[PDB]
DNA sequence: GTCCTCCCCTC
DNA sequence: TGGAGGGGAGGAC
């Protein structure tokens, strides 16, 4: 009993086979996979260049992605192209594709940009908008590969996915009769006791698993195991599952590399939040694995603060630093040691801060009715044990077309509508591509126009768009756009308004119809 | 009841 | 940065 048995139960293991519940198991095996230098790799592949070519993706005068080759010269995202040229004589800057105002398609103008001397080879900010479609297209191809490999994939941003490897790990653990640990030892023989129990079917779901067999310690992790204290690699079933998951994840990443050409970095752990930190730890082309017994070593390595966690990077994180009196460094360890035993300790502390007459609820981002959830979230995050589910997203949720405007390039309603015509062409084209690619009817329901005046004042309007089929979709979007921009022009009467500094159209709500 | 506006989160 | 995109609160309707 107890230290004579695993820390984990049959329930926790069997849960890995449930897509709805696998994430809440302490045995969960989550991967976060992030494309290295994504937009720069897309341009590299498009132009038939190699990983040794110092490519940068350029948007107007800013570098928005830097190849690992260019990084060797000290080039950083948001360098200007001129600053980058001073660091690397052999630099290959490639401008994003663009739409020209007055046209209804996008294209690349290779050999063109602000760095080019020839005045015939400029891509003027007055006259063009960006197309990110080449990057979106490649993102969707990658998504298709991830979903072919794994039954639960969350697209987290244009170049990131989370994978729940629970079913793959479980199935391998229990059923894989071919996997070799050594030249003399198969996985099936190493795990003969647990497989016998499982097939025998005689276990109690609430009973602890047996201690791991010595023979499973021959199982190898694939990738970089984060382990500065030199802890034993395989000591319980979580380590077994994680090691199996590292083997599978390398195979998935190799499929991405072989089919599309892209290198990835990857984080492997029992939770999404730790995976995301681990994927960014080592780049390019690496997989960082964070064992449960190494979570505190990792979180406390000095790279991370509580604000490093998803949702805590902005004003709520800053409020929590003030409310919880967190230090400027080693805040994660501080949270852990100050409320060491349970989340109720932290909840009690929060409730007192919040119940004070002088706490301003109208400006706070803390919900005083939800302090139990906040306390548990902070308690578990500080220990690397906050498990969030993965969501499989619809084909699309929202779609935006945006132009930040310089000079007088939008100086009247005539100019606004000219830009709306580009937005409507772009959005309709994106919708048609999704319909073809996923065999759906994709129907915009709501549109929002947002703009900024010369004084940077925001004006916005949203409402319904009618549907008449794909062949009338651009027209239906433009009808609403024109309506909204003229309405806002009236609202701006006698106020600082033209020339605008920004105009955007967003389809904020879609209906998606499946076809047989 | 849902819709519109404004705001906060991320890459 | 610009140009995305995800998500939710709460008063308007
Ligand atoms: N503020 C940002 C951040 C990123 N991107 C784009 C360019 C990136 O290539 C892509 C993915 O973002 P990442 O943060 O993953 O950065 P990279 O993939 O470029 O580099 P890394 O190898 O560090 O992941 O999104 C952008 O347009 N604006
Ligand atoms: Mg990336
Ligand atoms: Mg990213």
CA distance A177 to A457: 65
Nearest to A131 by CA among A63, A48, A39: A39
The secondary element (H helix, E strand) that includes residue A296 is helix A295-299
Nearest to A159 by CA among A253, A259, A67, A39: A39
The answer to whether A51 touches A69, Cβ cutoff 8 Å, is yes
The answer to whether A387 touches A28, Cβ cutoff 8 Å, is yes
On the 0-12 / 13-18 / 19+ scale of CB atoms within 10 A, A27 is: buried
Query: Residues A92-119, buried b or exposed e (16+ Cβ, 10 A)?
Result: bbbbbbbbbbeeeebebbeebbbbeeee
3-class DSSP assignment, residue A357:
coil
Rg (CA), chain A: 27
Number of residues assigned to chain A: 516
Instruction: Verify cis geometry, omega within 30 degrees of 0, for the bond prior to A363.
Output: no
Strand B, nucleotides < 7 Å from a protein CB: these are 3-11
Distances (CA, A) of A275 to A33, A53, A269, A386: 8, 30, 6, 11
Q: Which two tokens stand for residue A60?
A: 């107007």
CA distance A238 to A25: 10
CA at A276, C1' at B5: how many angstroms apart? 33
DSSP code of A61?
T
Q: Which two tokens stand for residue A315?
A: 């004003």
Q: Which two tokens stand for residue A80?
A: 């200007």
CA of A437 to the centre of ligand 2 (A): 24
To test the pocket of ligand 1, the residue of A34, A136, A159 to mutate (highest count of ligand atoms within 8 Å of its CB) is A159
The answer to whether A306 touches A381, Cβ cutoff 8 Å, is yes
State the method: X-ray
User: What is the DSSP secondary-structure string of A448-508?
Assistant: EEEEE-TT--EEEEEEE-----GGGHHHHHHHHHHHHHHHHHHHTTTSS-SSPSEEEEEEE
Distances (CA, A) of A132 to A37, A135, A275, A474, A478: 15, 6, 27, 19, 21
CA distance A172 to A180: 12
Contact partners, residue A295, CB within 8 Å, separation at least 6: A269, A274, A383, A384, A385
On the 0-12 / 13-18 / 19+ scale of CB atoms within 10 A, A327 is: exposed
Shortest-distance ligand to the CA of residue A160: 3
CA of A144 to the centre of ligand 1 (A): 20
Domains of chain A, each with CATH number or no CATH:
1-35+133-303 (3.30.70.270), 36-132 (3.40.1170.60), 304-382 (1.10.150.20), 397-516 (3.30.1490.100)
Residue carrying structure tokens 């592949």: A45
The answer to whether A221 touches A246, Cβ cutoff 8 Å, is yes
The runs of H, that is alpha helices, within A356-472 are 371-381, 413-438
The answer to whether A128 touches A101, Cβ cutoff 8 Å, is yes
User: What is the DSSP secondary-structure string of A112-174?
Assistant: -STT-S-GGG---TTTEEEE-HHHHHHHHHHHHHHHHH-S-EEEEETTEEEEE-HHHHHHHHH
CA distance A349 to A364: 16
On the 0-12 / 13-18 / 19+ scale of CB atoms within 10 A, A477 is: buried
CA distance A476 to A277: 43
Residue A507: alpha-carbon gap to chain centroid? 21
CA of A147 to the centre of ligand 1 (A): 22
What resolution does the deposited structure have, in angstroms?
Answer: 2.0
The annotated binding site of A for Mg(2+) is made up of 34, 159
CA distance A192 to A239: 18
Residues A39, A42, A47, CA angle at the centre, nearest 5°?
125
């Amino acid at each position: 009993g107890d230290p004579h048995m695993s820390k984990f139960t049959w329930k926790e293991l069997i849960q890995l086979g449930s897509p709805s519940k696998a994430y809440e198991s302490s045995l969960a095996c989550i991967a976060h996979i992030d494309m290295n230098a994504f937009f720069a790799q897309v341009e590299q592949m498009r132009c038939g260049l190699s990983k040794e070519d110092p490519v940068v993706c350029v948007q107007w005068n800013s570098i928005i992605a830097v190849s690992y080759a260019a990084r060797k010269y000290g080039i950083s995202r948001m360098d200007t192209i001129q600053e980058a040229l001073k660091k690397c004589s052999n630099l290959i800057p490639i401008h994003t594709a663009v739409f020209k105002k007055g046209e209804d398609f996008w294209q690349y103008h290779d050999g063109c940009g602000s760095w080019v001397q020839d005045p015939a080879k400029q891509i003027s900010v007055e006259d063009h908008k960006v197309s990110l479609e080449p990057y979106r297209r490649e993102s969707r191809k990658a998504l298709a590969i991830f979903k072919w490999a794994c039954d639960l994939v969350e697209r987290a941003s244009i170049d990131e996915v989370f994978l729940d490897l629970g079913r793959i790990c479980f199935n391998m653990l229990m059923f894989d009769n071919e996997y070799e640990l050594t030249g003399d030892l198969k996985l099936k023989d190493a795990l003969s006791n647990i497989r016998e129990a499982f097939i025998g079917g005689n276990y109690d779901i609430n009973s602890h698993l047996p201690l791991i067999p010595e023979k499973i310690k021959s199982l190898k992790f694939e990738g970089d195991v984060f382990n500065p204290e030199g802890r034993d690699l395989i000591t319980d079933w979580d380590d077994v599952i994680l090691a199996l998951g590292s083997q599978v994840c390398k195979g998935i990443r190799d499929s991405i590399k072989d089919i599309l050409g892209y290198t990835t970095s990857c984080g492997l752990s029992s939770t999404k939040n730790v995976c995301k930190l681990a994927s960014n730890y080592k780049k390019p082309d690496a997989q960082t694995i964070v064992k449960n017994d190494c979570l505190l070593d990792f979180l406390d390595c000095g790279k991370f603060e509580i604000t490093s966690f998803w949702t805590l990077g902005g004003v709520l994180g800053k409020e929590l630093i003030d409310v919880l009196d967190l230090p400027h460094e080693n805040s994660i360890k501080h949270i852990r040691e100050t409320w060491p035993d349970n989340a109720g300790q932290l909840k009690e502390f929060l409730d007192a801060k919040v119940k004070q007459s002088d706490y301003d609820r109208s400006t706070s981002n803390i919900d005083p009715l939800k302090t139990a959830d906040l306390a548990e979230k902070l308690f578990k995050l500080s220990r690397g044990r906050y498990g969030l589910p993965l969501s499989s997203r619809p084909v699309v949720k929202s779609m935006m077309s945006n132009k930040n405007l310089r000079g007088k390039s939008c100086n009247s309603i005539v100019d606004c509508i000219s830009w709306l015509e580009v937005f409507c062409a772009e959005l309709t084209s994106r919708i048609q591509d999704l319909e073809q690619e996923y065999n759906k009817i994709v129907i915009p329901r709501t549109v929002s126009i947002s703009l900024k005046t010369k004084s940077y004042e925001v004006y916005r309007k949203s409402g319904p768009v009618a549907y008449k089929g794909i062949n009338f979709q651009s027209h239906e979007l433009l009808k609403v756009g024109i309506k909204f921009v003229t309405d806002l022009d009236i609202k701006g009467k006698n106020k600082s308004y033209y020339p605008l500094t920004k105009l955007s159209m967003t389809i904020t709500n879609f209906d998606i119809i499946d076809l047989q």
